[PDB]
Write a protein that binds this ligand. Structure first.
Ligand SMILES: Nc1ncnc2c1ncn2[C@@H]1O[C@H](COP(=O)(O)OP(=O)(O)O)[C@@H](O)[C@H]1O
Ligand SMILES: Nc1ncnc2c1ncn2[C@@H]1O[C@H](COP(=O)(O)OP(=O)(O)O)[C@@H](O)[C@H]1O
Lengths: 70, 77, 371, 371, 185
């Protein structure tokens, strides 16, 4: 005969019960703007790299000093 | 054939498990001329004869309806 | 002043000052709301309920669960929880302490960024940190190297840590935690077919998981005993109502960890994951880890896990070399305890985030600054 | 009669007669089996599945991957694959042709010995050969000297070849291929935290590796653009289901080749390995290689690699001398194409293994007789 | 518990089965709930007149269409499971990623409730809510659904493989009911 408390509470409840809507709204929306940094993890990477390769390590001494021998 | 919406290849494979090891007188046909594909090779009183597949399975299928003759029985003729 | 740590390792939630032996009190992180027209007009309507208050009130409330798979589902709900916890248990104001945050490793940045954003803005708090579980687990267990298994309420972990460093490539992370297992339990339970599904009904199982579980020593042999005997079978009451009595259905449950067929996935299981992740990591270290093997929290509570684990490693290890595992009593608390230790050392004064940075740069700060 | 070549360079598998321009068809070398009780009784149960047939069927199948690190894992599975390939695609009988085999260089004898043993015994085949990738790469690229980089599905290579000869000491061989990179990708991907791990789920990435990747021109500068812009970011669908949209996570991936920290190892990378391996090799030749620089297959597909490579060499080279690299269109096919050329020349009639030797001496024959 | 609103009211088992006829005749599926309420305020064509199986004529309003909504909202007798459709999409999102399109294509319904006109349509409306619209969706609604099961059983009976598969008396001799639970699904 009506639209009621009973039905309004039904709608309210259903809203509360729907996990898909609210969880998707929070998680999927927040998922997209996720990331911006010059990561320190990559600072580690870079530093290690610096330590990594003979072309820096040996050559820095050997090209520089064996220039002048005598 | 009552398994639906599927392909004679399925049965090909079921042949290959079922008979192709087991059933001595039936054979995978050798290569031979005249034909794109032949699928069955078996041995007969006439000699030994080899035969092929188009997907035709449904052709043997028999539908029925009462209704069709059911009403024709009413009809004038 | 003084320094305060929140545990948000999932399940009941743990919070306490540096140097107390154990957190003041602990809360499930259930959230729940009304289900029915409110028909005592005398009643004050509160529309959301949390904690043991809800745990009492449950029946007309219905639950939401704000962390899936260790990922926290709905922020404002968290904020409700968090506010409640401070004021009601802690009688604490956000200014009062640095605060330390407890994180699943290797999981989406968003939890970092919003968590920090909220807690610096919504709460205003001298210093902030977020820390990875395994570090605490080592500090509490006090062996600078190790590998940790801790399968809590939430997503289930393998990290080898060597002394003083991370091997983030090494690491394995799994959604196999006890909650989902429990929900599988019901699909077991209908065999005996006393059967009920809703959230509170699901938590009722948690008690049984406390009481009734124990670890299969050998699966085949257990089945043979299952055919022989009923001592395997024990009798237990409804929390109120009936007595219920349970067969192999108890021991079958943990095997899922070893075989996640029963709710079906492939990752070859805790132990094979572990040895896999080892064989990733390099050759010489391995003996130490064969020695130093460490486990904690929700699943580990079960009697016997360590034994069959060792059986498994003796399968997979070359038997020639020593093997043992650690199974401390306190594992479920371990994390927050380690956090307390973590809080203690002055170096975090070097290390904390301060409000100033949050002023001068965004949430982005964290991801460089923290692990 | 006529002569037939299998490519077993990993990834999809390539097979074709001498003198065709391109192999008839190509197959991943996935192998997969059922995961669930077979519950259509109408269904014929086949217990193993391979190739695009599986690629369709995947979901209840689960994958095994019969080549790790270019080393073929499980022989009988290979035999399944191999048999299928002959009969189903090729409509070919083992007697019909000599057959040519395609090998990672510098890898354990066992692959030689069992491969030949099986294929002469299990298949019975007029003539057999196994050939090292780089040789084909030169023949197709048609410069008698060179150095090759080809990082396929499988283990990743440096070989200088001088005209008409090998420098097996010179050679470098690396397990850095795109598969493992891809599995690192997931440990990236959880940052955005759309997250799934299983084999098929991992292969889904392969498409993205086709579509979405491109090579970093400069890492710092790219990060600066990453702060500036979203054109760096592109929007892509699930193969079915969602649209997904991906940031720096695309370009960050190839850098692993330049920096295998991100899954962490030391070998100083493709380019530094190359210049190292040069500086091993002798002094005069070098200019030619500075001129003649050649790349192929799976990783190389990415746009831009050659450019940053040249940037790197201009770093490491004395700038004084000419530098260029070759980046042919067809690189991923290159090997089998070269194999076709290799098949063509009558000298292998001098060179093939014949059944007779396999009769009169073992698999041992190969290791003298072939490279 | 609806019907007492109009308050022609009877409770016993046979009286309850009398409703079954009305469930045959008088039900139809809500296309949209709000909009239906608006029509409910507007119109009586929504309202139809029906006899007792013997005795009175009875005439029924929204009380017809309100009934099926319970499937979508099991508040009205109150439970939580988020309903047929949300259960379905949930259970999908459990199942793995690639298959899903097929099921988006192949969607199948049968028997007692499904008899109602219109279910498939609002179901599709619901899936178009929950699906990413980008991908094809359809459902199957065969005529014969209520018989479907036994029909399929006939097919199941037909194939010789059950001769491999049946239980035989011999096993029941040699082992208990336990046989089944291994032997069958
Ligand atoms: N007495 C018990 N016996 C076994 N398991 C329990 C017991 N009490 C709680 N648990 C389980 O332990 C976990 C508690 O959460 P927790 O281990 O802190 O997860 P997290 O690692 O996310 O912090 C839940 O899975 C809970 O069901
Ligand atoms: N369109 C594409 N873009 C980039 N990489 C691709 C593409 N298609 C395939 N690949 C990759 O190329 C490799 C294909 O195998 P292949 O290069 O033949 O390896 P192998 O050198 O062992 O033969 C795999 O690593 C595959 O992921």
């Amino acid at each position: 005969x009506x639209x009621x408390x009973x039905x309004x509470x039904x709608x309210x409840x259903x809203x509360x019960x729907x996990x898909x809507x609210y969880x998707x709204x929070x998680x999927x929306x927040x998922x997209x703007x996720x990331x911006x940094x010059x990561x320190x993890x990559x600072x580690x990477x870079x530093x290690x790299x610096x330590x990594x390769x003979x072309x820096x390590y040996x050559x820095x001494x050997x090209x520089x000093x064996x220039x002048x021998x005598x | 054939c009552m398994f639906p919406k599927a392909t004679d290849t399925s049965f090909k494979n079921k042949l290959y498990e079922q008979h192709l090891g087991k059933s001595n007188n039936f054979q995978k046909p050798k290569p031979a001329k005249g034909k794109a594909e032949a699928h069955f090779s078996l041995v007969h009183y006439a000699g030994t004869v080899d035969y092929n597949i188009i997907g035709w399975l449904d052709k043997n299928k028999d539908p029925l309806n009462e209704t069709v003759v059911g009403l024709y029985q009413k009809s004038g003729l | 002043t003084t320094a305060l740590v929140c545990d948000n390792g999932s399940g009941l939630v743990k919070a306490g000052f540096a140097g107390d032996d154990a957190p003041r009190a602990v809360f499930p992180s259930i959230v729940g709301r009304p289900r029915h027209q409110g028909v005592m007009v005398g009643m004050g309507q509160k529309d959301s309920y949390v904690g043991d208050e809800a745990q009492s009130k449950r029946g007309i409330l219905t639950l939401k669960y704000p962390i899936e798979h260790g990922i926290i589902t709905n922020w404002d709900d968290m904020e409700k929880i968090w506010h409640h916890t401070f004021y009601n248990e802690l009688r604490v104001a956000p200014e009062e302490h640095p605060t330390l945050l407890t994180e699943a490793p290797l999981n989406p940045k968003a939890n970092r960024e919003k968590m920090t954003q909220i807690m610096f803005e919504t709460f205003n708090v001298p210093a902030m940190y977020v820390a990875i579980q395994a570090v605490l687990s080592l500090y509490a267990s006090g062996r600078t190297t190790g590998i940790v298994l801790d399968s809590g309420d939430g997503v289930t972990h393998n990290v080898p840590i060597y002394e003083g460093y991370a091997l983030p490539h090494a690491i394995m992370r799994l959604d196999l935690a006890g909650r989902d297992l429990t929900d599988y339990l019901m699909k077991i339970l209908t065999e005996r077919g006393y059967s009920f599904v809703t959230t509170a009904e699901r938590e009722i199982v948690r008690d049984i998981k406390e009481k009734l579980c124990y670890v299969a020593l050998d699966f085949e042999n257990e089945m043979a005993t299952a055919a022989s005997s009923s001592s395997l079978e024990k009798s237990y009451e409804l929390p109120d109502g009936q007595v219920i009595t349970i067969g192999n259905e108890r021991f079958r449950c943990p095997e899922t960890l070893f075989q996640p067929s029963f709710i079906g996935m492939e990752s070859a299981g805790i132990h094979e994951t572990t040895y896999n992740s080892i064989m990733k990591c390099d050759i010489d270290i391995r003996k130490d880890l064969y020695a130093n093997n460490v486990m904690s929290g929700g699943t580990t509570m079960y009697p016997g896990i360590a034994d069959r684990m060792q059986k498994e490693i003796t399968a997979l290890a070359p038997s020639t070399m020593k093997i043992k595992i650690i199974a401390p009593p306190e594992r479920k608390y371990s994390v927050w305890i380690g956090g307390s230790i973590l809080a203690s050392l002055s170096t975090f004064q070097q290390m904390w985030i301060t409000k100033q940075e949050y002023d001068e740069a965004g949430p982005s700060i964290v991801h460089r600054k923290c692990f």
